[PDB]
Amino acid sequence: FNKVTLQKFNGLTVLPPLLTDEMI
Amino acid sequence: TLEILDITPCSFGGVSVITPGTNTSNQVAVLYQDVNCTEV
Numbered sequence: 001f002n003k004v005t006l007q008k009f010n011g012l013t014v015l016p017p018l019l020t021d022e023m024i
Numbered sequence: 025t026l027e028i029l030d031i032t033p034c035s036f037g038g039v040s041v042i043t044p045g046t047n048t049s050n051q052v053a054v055l056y057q058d059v060n061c062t063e064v
């Protein structure tokens with residue numbers, strides 16, 4: 001998790017995943 | 025005034041329903057996407 005490099009203005013929406021990370 | 029300000033777009037998003045099928049019941053729930061709904 002500490003080795004990755006993961007905001008909205010106009011119509012862009014980032015839906016959250018159905019399964020959260022602690023669930024996985 | 026030579027103050028500095030910030031521009032954040034005011035809230036938008038899709039509305040979406042929760043329906044259990046019409047032949048089961050008629051009540052639905054409604055979801056408002058990314059709204060800190062103190063307000064409607």
Ligand SMILES: *[C@@H]1O[C@H](CO)[C@@H](O)[C@H](O)[C@H]1NC(C)=O
Nearest residue numbers: 035057058059060061062063
């Ligand atoms: C909604 O806004 C209030 C105002 O600061 C804040 O205290 C609260 O934590 C916010 N809720 C969420 C889920 O962001």
